[PDB]
């Protein structure tokens, strides 16, 4: 009588109806659920996520060490959302944002709502109001660690020394998630780690539908000098697609996420662009000796790459 698979399936279906689509899914599984998505500004990371972009109306957390690429991803996300005619908001609490750069990554700063809150409670409450206004596509919160409660913000003693921030951060999501979902607004929560987990990244752990583990890995040199850095991201949690997938992408100094960078990288693996030792070629054409030269190569001949972006964008999504 037992048909393990017919047996398992039924159960699984229940698991999902009881806790939501994605409550449990086979890693090898492919997707059909399209959502509505904000492109991570990275073809790979997009493919990684399994829906090509950050899901909408979901709580997202991008964490990692200082200067690793988290923000840039955040920034691209925003920009795209705006390109699609979406409204955006930045709850700042670290005063770091370089509007100039954001502009360069496609951001329309001049239309970017920005708030620089007095307390974690305010930073969080101000975002919730903005969210349930239902007119925002994306909302970015800079520095979850800076979401220090107000009791601590105002000179207050060590009595009642507590993990108050976690509570603050937690209660804040129990109430916010709902709205976001209804408002179809995606909320990235840039959560940085430094030894200047604990403190608010503990509640976001269970309230996020996607958790990216941004991290740097190699300083692009090309010949013998600085041009950029290569980041790797490991979706550690994806509740709308099989989790644990990975992705890498270049970020030349000043520039954002290199389009051609991705092209050459992905192309190679998917095999459209072959690499004999030390050299790159595409259907007879010699892109160049050395990724960088290959980048320039593609950065110049727009038609090419444009077809390999195509050839690539074809085999998948």
Look at residues 257, 273, 307 and tell me which one is the last residue of a structural domain.
257
Per the DSSP assignment, residues forming a β-bridge with 138 are 88, 186
- Assess if residue 135 is contained within a domain: yes
Same domain, 247 and 188: yes
CATH code, 265: 3.30.250.10
The token pair at 201 is 């990244």
Is 69 labelled a binding residue? yes
Coil, strand or helix at 261: helix
> Rounded to an integer, what distance in angstroms lies between the CA atom of residue 219 and that of residue 235?
22
- Contact predicate 91/142, CB 8 Å: yes
Number of domains in the chain: 2
Is 68 labelled a binding residue? yes
> Rounded to an integer, what distance in angstroms lies between the CA atom of residue 48 and that of residue 247?
6
Same domain, 98 and 59: yes
- Assess if residue 10 is contained within a domain: no
Within a 10 A sphere around the Cβ of 47, how many other Cβ atoms? 19
Cα separations in angstroms, 225 against 103, 229, 292:
27, 11, 11
The token pair at 77 is 């996300």
Within a 10 A sphere around the Cβ of 158, how many other Cβ atoms? 6
Same domain, 41 and 88: yes
Coil, strand or helix at 150: helix
Q: Tell me the longest C-alpha to C-alpha distance in the chain.
A: 72
- Contact predicate 237/243, CB 8 Å: yes
> Rounded to an integer, what distance in angstroms lies between the CA atom of residue 33 and that of residue 248?
24
Same domain, 90 and 75: yes
Same domain, 224 and 268: no
CA proximity to 53, closest of 66, 65, 67, 42: 42
> Rounded to an integer, what distance in angstroms lies between the CA atom of residue 145 and that of residue 148?
7
Tell me the structure's resolution in angstroms, rounded to a single decimal.
3.3
Cα separations in angstroms, 191 against 94, 213, 284, 292:
12, 10, 45, 31
> Rounded to an integer, what distance in angstroms lies between the CA atom of residue 210 and that of residue 54?
8
Is 67 labelled a binding residue? yes
- Assess if residue 18 is contained within a domain: no
Cα separations in angstroms, 257 against 71, 76, 77, 114:
11, 8, 11, 23
- Assess if residue 167 is contained within a domain: yes
- Assess if residue 3 is contained within a domain: no
Same domain, 107 and 208: yes
Domain that holds residue 226: 25-257
Is 6 labelled a binding residue? no
Same domain, 278 and 173: no
Same domain, 173 and 271: no
3-state helix, strand, coil in the chain (%, to 5): 40, 20, 40
Look at residues 257, 274, 289 and tell me which one is the last residue of a structural domain.
257
Per the DSSP assignment, residues forming a β-bridge with 238 are 210
Same domain, 193 and 303: no
Within a 10 A sphere around the Cβ of 108, how many other Cβ atoms? 13
Residues with Cβ within 8 Å of 224's Cβ and at least 6 positions away in sequence, in order, are: none
Alpha carbon dihedral 268, 274, 275, 280, in 10-degree steps, equals -100
Same domain, 206 and 286: no
Is 99 labelled a binding residue? yes
- Assess if residue 19 is contained within a domain: no
CATH code, 71: 3.40.50.300
Coil, strand or helix at 168: helix
- Assess if residue 132 is contained within a domain: yes
- Assess if residue 12 is contained within a domain: no
- 97 CA to centre of own chain: 17
> Rounded to an integer, what distance in angstroms lies between the CA atom of residue 105 and that of residue 69?
13
The token pair at 294 is 């290959």
Question: What's the alpha-carbon Rg for the chain, to the nearest Å?
Answer: 21
Same domain, 182 and 292: no
Same domain, 85 and 119: yes
Is 101 labelled a binding residue? yes
- Contact predicate 287/298, CB 8 Å: yes
Is 71 labelled a binding residue? yes
Look at residues 222, 239, 257 and tell me which one is the last residue of a structural domain.
257
- Contact predicate 277/75, CB 8 Å: no
């Amino acid at each position: 009588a037992p048909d393990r698979e017919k047996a398992l399936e039924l159960a699984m279906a229940q698991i999902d109806k009881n806790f939501g689509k994605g409550s449990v899914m086979r890693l090898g599984e492919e997707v059909r659920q399209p959502i509505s998505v904000i492109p991570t500004g990275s073809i790979s990371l997009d493919v990684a996520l399994g829906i090509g972009g950050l899901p909408r109306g979901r709580v997202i957390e991008i964490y990692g060490p200082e200067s690793s690429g988290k923000t840039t991803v955040a920034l691209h996300a925003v920009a795209n959302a705006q390109a699609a005619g979406g409204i955006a908001a930045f709850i700042d609490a670290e005063h770091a944002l370089d509007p100039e750069y954001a502009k360069k990554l496609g951001v329309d700063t001049d239309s970017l709502l920005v708030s620089q809150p007095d307390t974690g409670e305010q930073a969080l409450e101000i975002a919730d109001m903005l969210v349930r206004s239902g007119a925002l596509d994306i909302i970015v919160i800079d520095s979850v660690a800076a979401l220090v409660p107000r009791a601590e913000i105002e000179g207050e003693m060590g009595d009642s020394h507590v993990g108050l921030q976690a509570r603050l951060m937690s209660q804040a999501l129990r109430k916010m998630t709902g709205a976001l979902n209804n408002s179809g607004t995606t909320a990235i929560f840039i959560n940085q780690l430094r030894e200047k987990t604990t403190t608010g990244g503990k509640a976001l752990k269970f309230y996020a539908s996607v958790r990216l583990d941004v991290r740097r890995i190699e300083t692009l040199k090309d010949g013998t000098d600085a041009v950029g850095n290569r980041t790797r991201v490991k979706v550690v949690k994806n509740k709308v697609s099989p989790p644990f997938k990975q992705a890498e992408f270049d970020i030349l100094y000043g520039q954002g996420i290199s389009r051609e960078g991705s092209l050459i990288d992905m192309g190679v693996e998917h095999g459209f662009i072959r690499k004999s030792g030390s050299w790159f070629t595409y259907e007879g054409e010699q892109l160049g000796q050395g990724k960088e030269n290959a980048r320039k190569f593609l950065l110049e001949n727009t038609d090419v790459a444009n077809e390999i972006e195509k050839k690539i964008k074809e085999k998948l999504g």
